[PDB]
Amino acid sequence: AVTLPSHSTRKLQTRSQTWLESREYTKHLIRVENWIFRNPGFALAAAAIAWLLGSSTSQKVIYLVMILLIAPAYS
Amino acid sequence: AVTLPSHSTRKLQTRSQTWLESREYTKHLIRVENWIFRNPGFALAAAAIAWLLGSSTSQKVIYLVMILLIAPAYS
Amino acid sequence: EVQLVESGAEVKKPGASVKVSCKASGYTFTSYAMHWVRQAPGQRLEWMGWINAGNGNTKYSQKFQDRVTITRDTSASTAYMELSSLRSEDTAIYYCARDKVDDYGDYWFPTLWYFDYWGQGTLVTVS
Amino acid sequence: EVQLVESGAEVKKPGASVKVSCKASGYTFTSYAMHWVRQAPGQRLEWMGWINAGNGNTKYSQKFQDRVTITRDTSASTAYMELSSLRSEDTAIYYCARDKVDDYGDYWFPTLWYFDYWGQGTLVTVS
Amino acid sequence: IRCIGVSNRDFVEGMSGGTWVDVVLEHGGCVTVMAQDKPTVDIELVTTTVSNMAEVRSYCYEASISDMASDSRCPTQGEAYLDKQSDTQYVCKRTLVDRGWGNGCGLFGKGSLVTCAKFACSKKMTGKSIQPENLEYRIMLSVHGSQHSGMIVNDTGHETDENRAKVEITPNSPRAEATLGGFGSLGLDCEPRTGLDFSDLYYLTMNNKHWLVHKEWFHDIPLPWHAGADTGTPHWNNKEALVEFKDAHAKRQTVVVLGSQEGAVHTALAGALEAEMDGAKGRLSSGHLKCRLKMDKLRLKGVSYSLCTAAFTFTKIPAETLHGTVTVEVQYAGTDGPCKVPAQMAVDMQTLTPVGRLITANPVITESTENSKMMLELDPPFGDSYIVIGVGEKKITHHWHRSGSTIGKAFEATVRGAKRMAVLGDTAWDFGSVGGALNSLGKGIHQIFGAAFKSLFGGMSWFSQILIGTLLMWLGLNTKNGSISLMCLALGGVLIFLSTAVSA
Amino acid sequence: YLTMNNKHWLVHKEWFHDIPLPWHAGADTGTPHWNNKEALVEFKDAHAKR
Amino acid sequence: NMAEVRSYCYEASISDMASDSRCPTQGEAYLDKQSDTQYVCKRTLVDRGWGNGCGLFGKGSLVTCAKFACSKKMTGKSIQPENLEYRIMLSVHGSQHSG
Amino acid sequence: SALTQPASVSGSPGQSITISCTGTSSDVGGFNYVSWFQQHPGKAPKLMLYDVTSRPSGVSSRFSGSKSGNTASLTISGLQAEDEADYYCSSHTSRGTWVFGGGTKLTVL
Amino acid sequence: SALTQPASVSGSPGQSITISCTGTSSDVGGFNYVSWFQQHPGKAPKLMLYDVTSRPSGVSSRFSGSKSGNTASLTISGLQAEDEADYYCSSHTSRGTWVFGGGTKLTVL
Ligand SMILES: *[C@@H]1O[C@H](CO)[C@@H](O)[C@H](O)[C@H]1NC(C)=O
């Protein structure tokens, strides 16, 4: 099983609506949320880690975005 | 559908065999790879993007790992 | 001791309306509450009750949901169940029993015991 | 101590559904065991078995991979072996014997002994 | 006995501190306890019981869709509606898409259409709930000593056999006093309550195969939950998730099932527990227990007997089994009665005097006849050695050579000591006994770092675990103070380790 | 075209050639020889019990 | 006029099981199904003790080969630019309404 | 929805009998609300249990209640000759109404 | 997979008899599983061997098993008066099924 491919990495662009375009995006976000709703601790660790790299202020925030987004989705 | 939760975000730790521990940990990796084998272009764009942030050398490589891992899974 | 007594009714033909009284004796009214459990001989007890004598509240079984209405009278310390539009089948005996209210006066969850006493019965028969 | 009885497998006609029962007695069945070994008159004991226990699993001899099955009922500690279509050659005695099951309740490797007791035997004839 | 070549078996040598030894029993292996004296008891923990249960929600795998009768209205005589929405067993999504003059407004534009489908399920999860009370971990006791590996037969379920003894310990009656005839009554006091953190695990059904999963996982499934109180008319909350209304771009609306989601739910279960059910329990594999094993009442049995006579014929070639002992099973012929069984591992014969510390103390044969049948175990030294019982004329000797060195047993043992720390860890310090200011201060620190760690990095699959491992590694090669770099690299290294130990 | 049961939708030759499930080739006469099979039918054991 | 380029079986029906059970240092277990074509086999090592009954102890090399089967395959039917079509429609307002 | 209670039973004095009242999760299982009413026929019922295991003060102590799953077991020992009271099991459902079981006519010998 | 043990061999009271069961590497040789079933014409074949030897609890010393490859030798000496019965040799194949030899009916005295 573990059907990997998500057809949206391709999709097709056309006048008519694709299969699950709505269900799709909201879904991608709502997955991340009740991921982090169940692990605030990882928001702490991810916070300290990210804020430890780059020294430059904002990318810091880029590191937090990268890390909060990769933990639930792939892994 | 699109059942979000993947039980491995918790698992259970016991001497006994978990459900799909083997085909689990890999099907993660093999999902990332073809996903990458079908879009080398995104390796180019991700390369240039990452290498434009952080100026610090090895921070760059962290950005490419950041981005190559974020694209196939977390949309 | 605790005393429950009732009025021994008669048939009051099909379609009539029975009114049975339960006048509580031997304990404190104001903590009595009240139930009505119908039975005739040879089948299972149905509980068609109500549960609150302090506030006059009521809860009825879904079978009887609207048939019976109940009046409480504390001056006579008496609860009156009245079954309107009775039929041939409801030939039975109606016991009134108590399950003491929680002190708040609101009755939601009973005592762990329910019925520590019983009316002595009123057999009601339909023609 | 240990009793195993069956009801006799007379004779049906070639094309008959024969069901034999094995009533476990005395010995606790709980996690018990079983087997079925049919031998024809002075025959090459055949093992057409079903490794049953509590769980109700089975594994059939290649010869009866899909001809007969034996469901468990622990209400009476009874195993039912049912061989669809009693053809003529079957006249042999179906014995039920036990190889009591492993601790875990799952049965993989049998005990060193196999069959410490045996059914009375059932003659079933195709004629 | 009952544990040989069983792998994960861990033998504890000597209780210490006044006949008190605490041990952790997990189904994946055994524990064989050996004291200075007293028989060597072999404890093996089998199964688990799930009792009363209860249902929590349900989830539908498969959606029948019938009807779909539609209602449309004019550009302005409001939005649409039809009788079937009050049914609550249907699903309807009013989407404003249609056109004028075709249907009939004389008002080009918009339109609202309600499309209502009948939703009935077929295959569905129950998702039952576990509460820690009433589940008892069945546990089996097996003492070494005299035994074939069957031959005695009769097991000790009900008793007879008199070598082994079943104990079922439940949080409403712990302290499972176990009576081993003639050896001693081995009592043991176990906590069923606190070991696995149940109440966080819902017992989960599909078709037959059953699983255990987190409430945290089980409430997050995007299915049309049910409430599981009763049927009669199952009322499906949601229904939106499993059906999808696809409106065509040019005109109209379609109702489309998502089809059986069954297998996808199998994929989402990666890393559950594999579970077995029956009508009143549902055999639970895996698990772990914690128990203080009280050796107070025991006896070596027939410490007092003769040495038998002439025999020593041994049946099999001892068989170098995994991790330690060469497990011997002889048949002294001609013995009269319940006489002792002499065994010694000799460094050299030569003057007798073995150092072997065999793990099967005071072995004893049974009755008269000749069938005998006694099985033993002997832990020889790693070097070459001679296996000898030294009685009668010329006895019978054997030559055996262990492999591996004290260094190998050193690394090997901590390998598993680590896995004991890895899985079930924070109780791993309960494998050792009579601790204070070594094993408790230890279990304390490990418990705090364990709670913080689990809280910090929960949500970690194996792959994730390796990634964050390596990031904390790379920080550990950099920054400053030799603290956050050393603390960081440390905690990273331990994830990498817990990952590899999970996999192995 | 990708047919499951009585419904059909286009998919490219990447999502479609990337699927882990069994291959099967061109036709179903009799019963086909199923390529792969590892994706379905996942079997492993612990405690070393069959 | 469409072809069929491959197929997938989105369902599965396993059957027939059996097992190997050969001892350690007896080499390998055979069981003949690894010869026949649709019976999936994955060889695993059962650390094997005296319960089963073998001489040594360690990884025992058995595999259960259960016969695969399928139901309700999804077909990948493929097309090319040929055997395509459109059926376009025309309007030309003029004066009409409904035809 | 009446609780399941079996019609009737008998036996030697002193001998333990078991009356099984089987409900659903709605009432007997997810509550400890039970009671068994001894009803002398033609006389008024009385309550011989309450809170399961417990008993009112005037109860003959040889009555014993028990529950597991959906069950209500009234187990009596050394039945004294005059212990035939039609036994009815009753409980508080979740919906807030009480239901009396089918009742067990008790048969003494 | 089949059991070929011999049909019937005769011997006088007291001299030893030897029944040979010849199997495959798949069953008899590659395992310790062997069992010999004494079947009297009247009663069901009952356990009397199990694993080479190891009398169950009816030792009647006069029965001994042995193995030398794919062999099973049950050697009875001291003919047990009316010990005449069919003897069947059994084995656990590795495929997971049991096989029983063609049986040796014995002749005594
Ligand atoms: C087996 O148990 C029975 C009692 O059920 C006992 O009489 C018999 O002696 C026991 N035999 C063995 C070998 O344990």
Residue numbers in the entry:
A (entry chain F), B (entry chain D): 1 to 75
C (entry chain K), D (entry chain I): 1 to 52, 52A, 53 to 82, 82A, 82B, 82C, 83 to 100, 100A, ...
E (entry chain A): 1 to 504
F (entry chain C): 203 to 252
G (entry chain C): 52 to 150
H (entry chain L), I (entry chain M): 2 to 26, 26A, 26B, 26C, 27 to 94, 94A, 95 to 106
Q: How did the manuscript describe this experimental structure?
A:
The cryoEM structures of ZIKV-C10 complex at pH8.0, pH6.5 and pH5.0 are determined to 4.0, 4.4 and 12 Å resolution, respectively. A comparison of the E proteins of the pH8.0 complex structure with that of the previously solved uncomplexed ZIKV2 shows that they are largely the same. The glycan loop changed in conformation when compared to the uncomplexed virus (inset), likely due to its interaction with the Fab molecule. In the 4.0 Å resolution pH8.0 complex cryoEM map, the likely interacting residues that form the epitope were identified, by using a cutoff of 5 Å distance (hydrogen bonds/electrostatic interaction: 4 Å and hydrophobic interactions: 5 Å) between side chains of the Fab and E proteins. Each end of the E protein dimer has a Fab molecule attached. The Fabs bind across the E proteins at the intra-dimer interface. The ability of Fab C10 to bind E proteins at the intra-dimer interface together with the virus quaternary structure-dependent sites—the inter-dimer and inter-raft interfaces, suggests that the entire E protein layer is locked.
An E protein contains three domains—DI, DII and DIII5.
